[PDB]
Write a protein that binds this ligand. Sequence first.
Ligand SMILES: Nc1ncnc2c1ncn2[C@@H]1O[C@H](COP(=O)(O)OP(=O)(O)NP(=O)(O)O)[C@@H](O)[C@H]1O
Ligand SMILES: Nc1ncnc2c1ncn2[C@@H]1O[C@H](COP(=O)(O)OP(=O)(O)NP(=O)(O)O)[C@@H](O)[C@H]1O
Ligand SMILES: [Mg+2]
Ligand SMILES: [Mg+2]
Ligand SMILES: [Mg+2]
Ligand SMILES: [Mg+2]
Lengths: 305, 319
Amino acid sequence: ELNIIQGALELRTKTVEDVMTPLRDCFMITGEAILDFNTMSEIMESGYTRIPVFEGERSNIVDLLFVKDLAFVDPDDCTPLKTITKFYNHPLHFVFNDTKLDAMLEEFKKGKSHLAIVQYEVLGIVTLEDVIEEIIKSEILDETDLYTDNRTKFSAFKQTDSEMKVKISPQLLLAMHRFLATEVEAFSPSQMSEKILLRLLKHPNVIQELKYDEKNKKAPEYYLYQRNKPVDYFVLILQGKVEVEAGKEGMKFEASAFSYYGVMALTASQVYIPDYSVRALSDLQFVKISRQQYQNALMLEHHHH
Amino acid sequence: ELNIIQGALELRTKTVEDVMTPLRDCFMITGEAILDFNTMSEIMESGYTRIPVFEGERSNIVDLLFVKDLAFVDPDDCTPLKTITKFYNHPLHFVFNDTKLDAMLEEFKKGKSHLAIVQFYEVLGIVTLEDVIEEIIKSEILDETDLYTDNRTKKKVAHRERKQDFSAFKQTDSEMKVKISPQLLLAMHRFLATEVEAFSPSQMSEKILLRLLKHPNVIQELKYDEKNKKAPEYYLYQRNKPVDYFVLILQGKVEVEAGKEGMKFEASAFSYYGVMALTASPVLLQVYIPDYSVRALSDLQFVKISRQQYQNALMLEHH
Ligand SMILES: Nc1ncnc2c1ncn2[C@@H]1O[C@H](COP(=O)(O)OP(=O)(O)NP(=O)(O)O)[C@@H](O)[C@H]1O
Ligand SMILES: Nc1ncnc2c1ncn2[C@@H]1O[C@H](COP(=O)(O)OP(=O)(O)NP(=O)(O)O)[C@@H](O)[C@H]1O
Ligand SMILES: [Mg+2]
Ligand SMILES: [Mg+2]
Ligand SMILES: [Mg+2]
Ligand SMILES: [Mg+2]
């Protein structure tokens, strides 16, 4: 409890440069940047709430970007960063290198930004948390933040399609992974780690599409399932509309994306016979997992020790 | 700045309650909420990074939502908050009110969620790192909405800037279509073919009527806003306001105020209105003006045929 008092008595002497983060170690984003899934994944993997937006050279910091700004962003839209910065237009908080931490804190208290640029040769950036970690004499962290300013230290966003059999937007795959890991116990984390689930979803020929042709509208090729015909594979619609004819009387209803079928085919029921038929009414794009594949994924999860 | 040097002596004895936020004034979110546009707008207007998540009563805080967990959420998808809160499953730091701020700061600096719920356990409130720091330094810190520093101080700063009327982001809200069962379609089809003469086989063969009913936008829905009542957009028919479209209520309730004296009655399904609007005879031309006002009392699903469409259907005369 003496470290806090020490730091308090020493704040009038220490300047921003004593706790400054060199410009070489700053996490920046160019203003001429688009918020496609890859850029947003790179933004989030750093776990930095406030990121400076620079135009041209890195020393030219022109705006700010808050992770809280990425709420209504759809990575599918691939919106440009300029539109977001214009809608929000965060205020720049400037400071000089020859400043005392007392004045720094006085500014941050009512300041429009807890992140400030230290300069007009820009050297780096200082945040309220730096000042307070220096005062308290003990470092801080919300574990989302990567490391504690000493070059020493979660799911990597590696859900990107790079020219494979079928094309789906990374945001779609992410929603798939989330929905399966959450609302289906067969793919729950407790039974199968998320990394293994992701490997399984992007496994070749698992995710597949299907084109609709009025000619063969009721052909056996467009039937993902047939009543009282055994199968061994689990389906999860990603895009499209399907007609489910269920029950012994054959009640017909419609189902769109994120409607899964035949979970028991994967786990032990032994045999799985669905009392329903799933026909395609449009272009379908879905996941198809075989019992063998699910068992292999479980083998993977139990093999890592 | 001398307060900082004694803030330590205070942190060794103070308790969370001295600087705690009261569970009564905490902005929370229901456990079963959906992260649609409206809910996301609430969340982002409140301007709070961490939001407790309770199931049922406010005292049963079970989860914790981070705003960072919304980066890859689409308000258009209407993603349930349950999936996110169960997928990220951020841990909760439960604490007792008799917790010296020393151990509190020790726990916070460790990495556990900065927001800790202080508590047949009873809920006491919320404790944040910035709260302990504002108590130590005895100063005000603010980048979220409210200026309250330690306890009981409602205030306004910069004209409540965080609430920015986000409606510009919204999607068009254009329903892809209206789903009517095949059986409801057949029932409506037959009812119009029989009772109403305009749609009778004498003037429209079955095929042309089916095409007109399957035509785009003829079948429509109308959501009921219990608060925004009597809106001029919810009046299918206005009294003595020329109209040119025939209606047929398939599902829902409507209040019909008819007669100059204005008697109001309640009509439900298969109660159609303004059939003469379809007639196109020479005469602001050959106007039809109804003597009634039809407004909605519940969600409506109906047909709505313009005079155009009907006369086109009649123009489809092929022997
Ligand atoms: N954009 C950034 N790039 C690099 N380092 C940063 C950045 N922002 C803050 N830091 C450093 O990260 C450490 C902790 O700062 P901090 O203010 O906690 O970041 P943060 O947690 O992301 N913001 P907050 O959400 O308020 O906690 C300090 O050493 C800062 O200098
Ligand atoms: N869910 C909540 N509802 C109402 N008030 C809250 C809530 N969470 C925190 N507060 C209060 O809001 C103040 C701001 O907390 P704060 O630690 O700044 O959150 P935060 O800024 O989003 N996290 P950070 O980015 O590190 O600053 C605190 O003093 C709390 O008293
Ligand atoms: Mg931090
Ligand atoms: Mg989308
Ligand atoms: Mg804050
Ligand atoms: Mg959108």
